[PDB]
Amino acid sequence: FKIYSKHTPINLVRDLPQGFSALEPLVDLPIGINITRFQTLLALHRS
Amino acid sequence: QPTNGVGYQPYRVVVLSFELLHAPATVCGPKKSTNLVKNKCVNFNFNGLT
């Protein structure tokens, strides 16, 4: 499982900025499992 | 009891079971590095690249 990542400082309000940024390889995982689906995890704000 | 015979004394047994599955093998043995020699025509093996 290859995870590539890049952090970019942007100041655009709504859409994706137009530019070039190559993603460095961050971590390779020896998982050996089948993966066909994914889901994002968010954080709630409680008051 | 501490005064028992050798055939009745407690023996701790640890059994190590090694299996290979289709998943990438991660429990690897300790490869031993040699000393680095520079400025000579040598056969190099760096991380499996020879």
mmCIF file of C-alpha atoms in Angstrom:
data_model
loop_
_atom_site.group_PDB
_atom_site.id
_atom_site.type_symbol
_atom_site.label_atom_id
_atom_site.label_comp_id
_atom_site.label_asym_id
_atom_site.label_seq_id
_atom_site.Cartn_x
_atom_site.Cartn_y
_atom_site.Cartn_z
ATOM 1 C CA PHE A 1 0.000 0.000 0.000
ATOM 2 C CA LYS A 2 1.728 3.139 -1.235
ATOM 3 C CA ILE A 3 0.751 6.439 0.392
ATOM 4 C CA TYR A 4 2.115 9.507 -1.389
ATOM 5 C CA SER A 5 1.512 12.932 0.105
ATOM 6 C CA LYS A 6 2.225 16.615 -0.386
ATOM 7 C CA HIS A 7 1.433 19.697 1.706
ATOM 8 C CA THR A 8 0.910 22.929 -0.213
ATOM 9 C CA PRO A 9 0.289 26.457 1.125
ATOM 10 C CA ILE A 10 -2.547 27.977 -0.919
ATOM 11 C CA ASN A 11 -4.743 31.054 -0.606
ATOM 12 C CA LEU A 12 -7.510 30.249 -3.111
ATOM 13 C CA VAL A 13 -11.005 30.489 -1.654
ATOM 14 C CA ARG A 14 -13.107 27.890 -3.457
ATOM 15 C CA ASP A 15 -11.661 25.650 -6.182
ATOM 16 C CA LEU A 16 -8.424 23.756 -6.781
ATOM 17 C CA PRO A 17 -5.470 26.003 -7.670
ATOM 18 C CA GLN A 18 -3.793 25.600 -11.043
ATOM 19 C CA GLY A 19 -0.153 24.592 -10.788
ATOM 20 C CA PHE A 20 2.335 21.757 -10.489
ATOM 21 C CA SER A 21 3.311 19.919 -7.307
ATOM 22 C CA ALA A 22 4.850 16.446 -7.404
ATOM 23 C CA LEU A 23 3.796 14.186 -4.544
ATOM 24 C CA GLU A 24 6.604 12.665 -2.524
ATOM 25 C CA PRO A 25 6.279 9.029 -1.412
ATOM 26 C CA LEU A 26 5.467 9.065 2.276
ATOM 27 C CA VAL A 27 4.934 5.493 3.474
ATOM 28 C CA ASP A 28 4.759 1.975 2.019
ATOM 29 C CA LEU A 29 2.654 -0.453 4.020
ATOM 30 C CA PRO A 30 3.027 -4.279 3.976
ATOM 31 C CA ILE A 31 -0.703 -4.994 4.241
ATOM 32 C CA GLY A 32 -1.313 -7.908 1.820
ATOM 33 C CA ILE A 33 -5.096 -7.442 1.870
ATOM 34 C CA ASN A 34 -7.807 -6.815 -0.696
ATOM 35 C CA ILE A 35 -9.207 -3.262 -0.736
ATOM 36 C CA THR A 36 -12.044 -2.168 -3.029
ATOM 37 C CA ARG A 37 -13.870 0.588 -1.078
ATOM 38 C CA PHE A 38 -12.937 3.629 0.993
ATOM 39 C CA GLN A 39 -14.587 6.268 3.169
ATOM 40 C CA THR A 40 -13.376 9.642 4.441
ATOM 41 C CA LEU A 41 -13.301 10.357 8.192
ATOM 42 C CA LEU A 42 -14.325 13.836 9.344
ATOM 43 C CA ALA A 43 -14.455 15.639 12.687
ATOM 44 C CA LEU A 44 -17.572 17.145 14.222
ATOM 45 C CA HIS A 45 -17.736 20.499 15.998
ATOM 46 C CA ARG A 46 -19.765 20.381 19.213
ATOM 47 C CA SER A 47 -21.175 23.325 21.155
ATOM 48 C CA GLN B 1 8.779 -28.947 44.189
ATOM 49 C CA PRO B 2 12.448 -27.830 44.112
ATOM 50 C CA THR B 3 13.679 -31.290 45.183
ATOM 51 C CA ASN B 4 11.974 -33.204 42.363
ATOM 52 C CA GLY B 5 13.745 -35.269 39.734
ATOM 53 C CA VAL B 6 14.682 -34.016 36.284
ATOM 54 C CA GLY B 7 11.718 -35.826 34.723
ATOM 55 C CA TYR B 8 9.238 -34.052 36.994
ATOM 56 C CA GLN B 9 10.821 -30.579 37.123
ATOM 57 C CA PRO B 10 9.001 -27.728 35.339
ATOM 58 C CA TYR B 11 10.193 -26.949 31.821
ATOM 59 C CA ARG B 12 9.196 -23.783 30.001
ATOM 60 C CA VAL B 13 8.453 -24.477 26.328
ATOM 61 C CA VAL B 14 8.263 -21.797 23.629
ATOM 62 C CA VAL B 15 7.257 -23.043 20.177
ATOM 63 C CA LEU B 16 7.932 -20.717 17.250
ATOM 64 C CA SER B 17 5.734 -21.376 14.213
ATOM 65 C CA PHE B 18 6.876 -19.948 10.876
ATOM 66 C CA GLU B 19 4.355 -19.643 8.054
ATOM 67 C CA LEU B 20 4.548 -18.009 4.640
ATOM 68 C CA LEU B 21 1.380 -16.460 3.223
ATOM 69 C CA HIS B 22 0.758 -14.544 -0.017
ATOM 70 C CA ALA B 23 1.015 -11.261 1.932
ATOM 71 C CA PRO B 24 4.476 -9.580 1.933
ATOM 72 C CA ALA B 25 6.816 -11.148 4.475
ATOM 73 C CA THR B 26 7.776 -8.637 7.163
ATOM 74 C CA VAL B 27 9.564 -10.647 9.896
ATOM 75 C CA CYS B 28 13.016 -10.741 8.306
ATOM 76 C CA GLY B 29 16.380 -11.784 9.700
ATOM 77 C CA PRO B 30 19.134 -9.299 10.553
ATOM 78 C CA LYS B 31 21.321 -8.815 7.478
ATOM 79 C CA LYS B 32 24.831 -7.887 8.612
ATOM 80 C CA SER B 33 26.475 -4.857 7.007
ATOM 81 C CA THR B 34 30.183 -4.897 6.201
ATOM 82 C CA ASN B 35 32.584 -1.974 6.371
ATOM 83 C CA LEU B 36 32.431 0.449 3.460
ATOM 84 C CA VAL B 37 35.491 0.595 1.190
ATOM 85 C CA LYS B 38 35.880 3.528 -1.199
ATOM 86 C CA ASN B 39 38.067 4.375 -4.220
ATOM 87 C CA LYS B 40 38.464 0.747 -5.353
ATOM 88 C CA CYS B 41 36.732 -1.442 -7.925
ATOM 89 C CA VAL B 42 34.550 -3.594 -5.662
ATOM 90 C CA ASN B 43 31.346 -5.597 -5.977
ATOM 91 C CA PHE B 44 28.651 -3.564 -4.239
ATOM 92 C CA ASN B 45 25.347 -4.906 -2.904
ATOM 93 C CA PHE B 46 23.263 -1.957 -1.672
ATOM 94 C CA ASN B 47 19.728 -2.902 -0.510
ATOM 95 C CA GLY B 48 19.586 -5.818 -2.926
ATOM 96 C CA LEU B 49 20.978 -3.845 -5.879
ATOM 97 C CA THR B 50 24.238 -5.488 -6.941
#
